[PDB]
Design a protein around this ligand. Structure first.
Ligand SMILES: *[C@@H]1O[C@H](CO)[C@@H](O[C@@H]2O[C@H](CO)[C@@H](O[C@@H]3O[C@H](CO[C@H]4O[C@H](CO)[C@@H](O)[C@H](O)[C@@H]4O[C@@H]4O[C@H](CO)[C@@H](O)[C@H](O)[C@H]4NC(C)=O)[C@@H](O)[C@H](O[C@H]4O[C@H](CO)[C@@H](O)[C@H](O)[C@@H]4O[C@@H]4O[C@H](CO)[C@@H](O)[C@H](O)[C@H]4NC(C)=O)[C@@H]3O)[C@H](O)[C@H]2NC(C)=O)[C@H](O)[C@H]1NC(C)=O
Ligand SMILES: *[C@@H]1O[C@H](CO)[C@@H](O[C@@H]2O[C@H](CO)[C@@H](O[C@@H]3O[C@H](CO[C@H]4O[C@H](CO)[C@@H](O)[C@H](O)[C@@H]4O)[C@@H](O)[C@H](O)[C@@H]3O)[C@H](O)[C@H]2NC(C)=O)[C@H](O)[C@H]1NC(C)=O
Ligand SMILES: *[C@@H]1O[C@H](CO)[C@@H](O[C@@H]2O[C@H](CO)[C@@H](O[C@@H]3O[C@H](CO[C@H]4O[C@H](CO)[C@@H](O)[C@H](O)[C@@H]4O)[C@@H](O)[C@H](O)[C@@H]3O)[C@H](O)[C@H]2NC(C)=O)[C@H](O)[C@H]1NC(C)=O
Ligand SMILES: *[C@@H]1O[C@H](CO)[C@@H](O[C@@H]2O[C@H](CO)[C@@H](O[C@@H]3O[C@H](CO)[C@@H](O)[C@H](O)[C@@H]3O)[C@H](O)[C@H]2NC(C)=O)[C@H](O)[C@H]1NC(C)=O
Ligand SMILES: *[C@@H]1O[C@H](CO)[C@@H](O[C@@H]2O[C@H](CO)[C@@H](O[C@@H]3O[C@H](CO)[C@@H](O)[C@H](O)[C@@H]3O)[C@H](O)[C@H]2NC(C)=O)[C@H](O)[C@H]1NC(C)=O
Ligand SMILES: *[C@@H]1O[C@H](CO)[C@@H](O[C@@H]2O[C@H](CO)[C@@H](O)[C@H](O)[C@H]2NC(C)=O)[C@H](O)[C@H]1NC(C)=O
Ligand SMILES: [Ca+2]
Ligand SMILES: [Zn+2]
Lengths: 237, 400, 144, 48
């Protein structure tokens, strides 16, 4: 199994595997059984504003999500990114559904890492700002059944069944380039994200949550993940 | 003091003694009736009627004839045709129906008011499918007896798609018990790993025809899907070389259980199973062991609800029996260590799904336990098996 | 009610649970029971006051067996609907013994129409020779 | 005792040196697969 650290924006309670009774923002260290969770309001078809940081001046792996006119779910868990995740990664997006349908449209995505060439002397970066997902976006390694284009949207579901997105669908959105992390030039790699999603109400209890992972440089859909495994885990452990 | 009448529908034996299920019901009434520790005020009386067992109209009369007289639970016939009838009588008027033998539940039959104390073949077919993987088979041949057996082992037919066992489903010939042409094809077909699906009478008569065709040797292995393999006289086959693996739910190791089989065999005084049958003489068949549990699991439920009285429900101007809503819960929320282990039901459909198979097999001392199956766990085998050395510190060929 | 009012032929309460009731009623009191859909004839159910105008699956399962010999398949795949459906295909499941077929039997999940779990696995196993056993409603639902 | 040890199969062959093999009830063994070859001097084919 690939080593993977994700932020589940889980839109479905999974009481069998440790997800709480409420839909929740989460955090993962090689585990769909989350370290820390928090209540997320989970509005209908609306928009987006998520944000994930890890500054090793404070070594807190934080994540916040806010709709407009809604609150913020700080779910910050201190975890040591020294040993829990490899030197070179391949970040990206992950979303899935199963037996209940939901729309998992991402409509903009960013990232900004800054890792210590020599702490003051001009640290490295990978800033991108995909506000204009094209029809043939050839710097995404979108796996599974992920779709794109036809608008400015990244549709991580098999969609356009009048927005009833064909349940037990799954699609990942891995970015094309690797990032240096492990420690080695120590671990202040304050990777940022901005993760404006859209989750449309299907009138069907919208469910199975979107993710944002930091995986191995090699990855695929693990052994079937349409459901509780949320797009990126092989097992429920 | 308080009266409490159970119903009963059984097969009509016209000349001999009554059936093994009917004697087990008469026994389990009398055992509880003479013990005050369980159920202090009950005066459990029976209303055992007899049907031709192949008539769904006759089963509907004797269901209503008991229920007009007044019952508390109907313990049901043992057919598939009559049980689907009497269940719909029991579901209509309210009283619970207590099944002791397997029935094809139609998936669109929205019924409460039935529990099936027979171990359901969906959960048994995992235990066969787990067992063929333990022996690592790839050339499995299922042999059933009637067309209902494809329903019963359907989770076994549905698995060359996941695993690599290659099924070659055959059928025993009807209108006879002479399966000489079947075993010619299987011997010529190099079929060395056979799963029968037989009643224990027909599972006994298949082996004498397998013995006389020289087909029970060291390179054959038979899995019987009966829960009554222990009642087969295996004396001609013990030294043979043949492997006969089966399942047994009848918890004979417990002395409180094994006293009852001892008390069962004495009180029968029935027609002798002559040596043309191939069965042992005095045992409890697993069809009659479950009817013993059928009284007790309801008898636990009447303990927790003492206000229960019996009404006079008439089938034409039918109304729900007012205790029938409450009393069905205490049957389903019930646990009792009977002869077949614990009896625990399922909160959905009343199929018995969690149970305790003891996997027995044939060695040169008779039938012998070689493990234990559970639905939650897997095959807890290697209880008779001991060893597996695996000394890989050898072969000395080349370092580099 | 109808036998008390007096009829000549009860035309088929058309389901396996509802037929076995009225069939043994009609065997008892005498009137013919005109079944118009296949049910499971129990082998020891000694009744004859009924006819069954649905074509028997003892004959039909030989006819599907005729086509898989005529189209010369060797990697057939049965997709059925109900647990009753293995009785509909008696002769088809019973014949890799007599020929060289490799019946890999699959079941549609109940209470749904998603073959999206199923057809994902059927494409995976390279199964191209599917034998469905649906109704005509659930035929077009899987074809879509 | 050879039947109950599963030893009369298709890959066995027994030669009896009795001249009275015909008086053995071979009914349990006819379908078995076993080869039982023997000798008989009793000229039963002659009607006299
Ligand atoms: C006893 O006999 C039983 C036979 O009935 C048998 O139990 C059966 O076991 C299977 C698994 O082997 C189980 O399937 C699981 O159960 C979930 C709930 O059942 C739903 O759905 C199934 C179909 O899967 C139906 O058969 C049920 O009737 C019930 O459907 C109802 O109908 C509506 C229709 O729209 C559904 O939307 C509703 O769910 C339901 N309405 C009600 C109850 O009022 C099933 O959903 C499970 O799927 C889980 O994983 C999916 C992966 O993506 C998720 O998408 C999905 O949502 C599920 O997550 C759980 O969902 C539950 C509700 O669906 C919630 O409790 C939770 O939110 C969630 N997380 C948890 C629990 O951690 C899965 O397929 C059968 O349902 C089950 N039958 C039952 C319970 O009747 C047993 O083997 C027998 N033995 C024993 C010992 O029990
Ligand atoms: C059905 O299959 C079983 C295996 O899958 C068969 O069990 C085999 O048969 C022998 C004799 O019945 C068993 O022997 C018993 O084992 C224990 C301990 O092991 C002994 O085994 C070695 C040989 O492997 C022997 O040389 C030693 O003396 C050991 O003591 C003894 O305590 C028992 O008394 C008895 O000997 C084996 O368990 C097993 N052997 C093999 C090689 O698989 C079973 O007999 C089959 N049924 C038949 C053939 O009718
Ligand atoms: C002891 O060893 C003998 C071999 O040394 C075994 O002899 C076999 O005996 C059987 C009879 O049981 C023979 O079958 C005969 O076949 C001839 C012609 O063969 C054709 O017949 C069948 C129909 O039976 C047909 O379907 C095929 O196309 C054959 O080509 C018939 O005329 C006879 O009536 C009889 O059927 C075998 O041929 C014969 N030889 C073998 C198997 O090599 C003998 O049976 C052994 N004893 C046992 C096993 O108990
Ligand atoms: C009437 O039925 C009751 C209920 O079974 C009998 O009382 C109890 O019976 C059980 C079964 O023999 C005894 O259980 C024993 O438990 C111990 C430790 O748990 C263990 O050695 C065995 O597992 C054994 O089953 C239990 O002692 C007994 N209770 C008593 C005697 O107070 C009762 O005996 C029955 N009445 C008559 C007259 O037999
Ligand atoms: C398969 O069945 C065997 C037999 O019961 C299981 O082994 C048993 O495992 C329990 C684990 O709690 C053992 O209990 C504990 O073991 C110590 C060891 O000395 C003992 O002093 C106590 O009795 C304590 O409760 C139990 O002894 C052991 N029984 C044995 C080895 O005969 C086994 O776990 C089962 N496997 C499964 C369910 O996968
Ligand atoms: C039956 O009737 C009386 C009713 O009070 C019984 O008294 C109680 O009955 C319950 C249930 O049978 C027992 O659990 C109690 O232990 C009984 N209490 C006492 C003080 O007896 C009584 O057991 C029976 N009486 C007769 C004459 O049969
Ligand atoms: Ca989840
Ligand atoms: Zn979650």
């Amino acid at each position: 199994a690939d080593t993977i650290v994700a932020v589940e924006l889980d839109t479905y309670p999974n009481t069998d595997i440790g997800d709480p009774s409420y839909p929740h923002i989460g955090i993962d260290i090689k585990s769909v059984r989350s370290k820390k969770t928090a209540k997320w309001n989970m509005q209908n078809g609306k928009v987006g504003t998520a944000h994930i940081i890890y500054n090793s001046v404070d070594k807190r792996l934080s994540a916040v999500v806010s709709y407009p006119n809604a609150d913020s779910a700080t779910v910050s868990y201190d975890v040591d990114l020294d040993n829990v995740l490899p030197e070179w990664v391949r970040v990206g997006l992950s979303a899935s559904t199963g037996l209940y349908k939901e729309t998992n449209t991402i409509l903009s995505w960013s990232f900004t890492s800054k890792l210590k060439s020599n702490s003051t002397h001009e640290t490295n970066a990978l800033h991108f700002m995909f506000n204009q997902f094209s029809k043939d976006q050839k710097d995404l390694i979108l796996q599974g059944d992920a779709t794109t284009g036809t608008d400015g949207n990244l549709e991580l579901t098999r969609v356009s069944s009048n927005g009833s997105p064909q349940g037990s669908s799954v699609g990942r959105a891995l970015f094309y380039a690797p990032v240096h992390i492990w420690e080695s030039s120590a671990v202040v790699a304050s990777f940022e994200a901005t993760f404006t999603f859209l989750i449309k109400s299907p009138d069907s209890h919208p469910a199975d949550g979107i993710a944002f992972f930091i995986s191995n440089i090699d990855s695929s859909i693990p052994s079937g993940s349409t459901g509780r495994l949320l797009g990126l885990f092989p097992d429920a452990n | 003091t308080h009266v409490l009448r159970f119903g009963g529908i059984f097969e009509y034996v016209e000349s001999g003694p009554m059936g093994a299920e009917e004697l087990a019901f008469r026994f389990a009434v009398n055992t509880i009736n003479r013990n005050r520790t369980l159920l202090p005020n009950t005066t459990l009386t029976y209303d055992t009627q007899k049907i031709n067992l192949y008539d769904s109209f006759e089963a509907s009369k004797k269901a209503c004839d008991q229920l007009s007289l007044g019952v508390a639970a109907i313990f049901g016939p043992s057919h598939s045709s009559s049980a689907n009838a009497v269940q719909s009588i029991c579901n209509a008027l309210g009283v619970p129906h207590i099944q002791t033998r397997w029935k094809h539940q139609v998936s669109d039959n929205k019924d409460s008011f039935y529990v099936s104390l027979y171990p359901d073949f969906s959960s048994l077919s995992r235990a066969i499918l787990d067992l063929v993987q333990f022996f690592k088979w790839k050339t499995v041949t299922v042999v059933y007896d009637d067309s209902t057996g494809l329903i019963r082992l359907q989770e076994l037919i549905k698995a060359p798609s996941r695993y690599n066992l290659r099924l070659k489903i055959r059928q025993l010939p009807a209108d006879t018990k002479d399966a000489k042409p079947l075993l010619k094809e299987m011997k010529r077909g190099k079929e060395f790993h056979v799963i029968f699906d037989c009643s224990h009478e027909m599972a006994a008569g298949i082996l004498k025809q397998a013995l006389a065709m020289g087909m029970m040797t060291e390179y054959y292995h038979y899995i019987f899907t009966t829960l009554d393999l222990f009642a087969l006289d295996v004396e001609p086959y013990r030294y043979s070389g043949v492997n006969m693996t089966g399942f047994r739910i009848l918890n004979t190791e417990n002395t409180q259980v094994s006293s009852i089989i001892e008390k069962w065999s004495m009180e029968r005084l029935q027609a002798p199973p002559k040596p043309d049958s191939g069965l042992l003489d005095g045992f409890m068949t697993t069809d009659a062991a479950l009817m013993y549990d059928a009284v007790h699991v309801v008898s636990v439920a009447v303990q927790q609800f003492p206000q229960m009285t019996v009404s006079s429900l008439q089938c034409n101007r039918h109304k729900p029996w007012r205790f029938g809503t409450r009393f069905m819960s205490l049957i389903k929320e019930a646990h009792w260590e009977g002869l077949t282990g614990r009896i625990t039901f399922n909160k959905t459909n009343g199929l018995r799904t969690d149970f305790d198979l003891d996997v027995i097999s044939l060695k040169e001392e008779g039938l012998e336990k070689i493990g234990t199956w559970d639905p939650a766990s897997g095959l807890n085998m290697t209880e008779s098996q001991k060893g597996k050395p695996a000394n890989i510190t050898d072969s000395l060929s080349n370092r580099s």
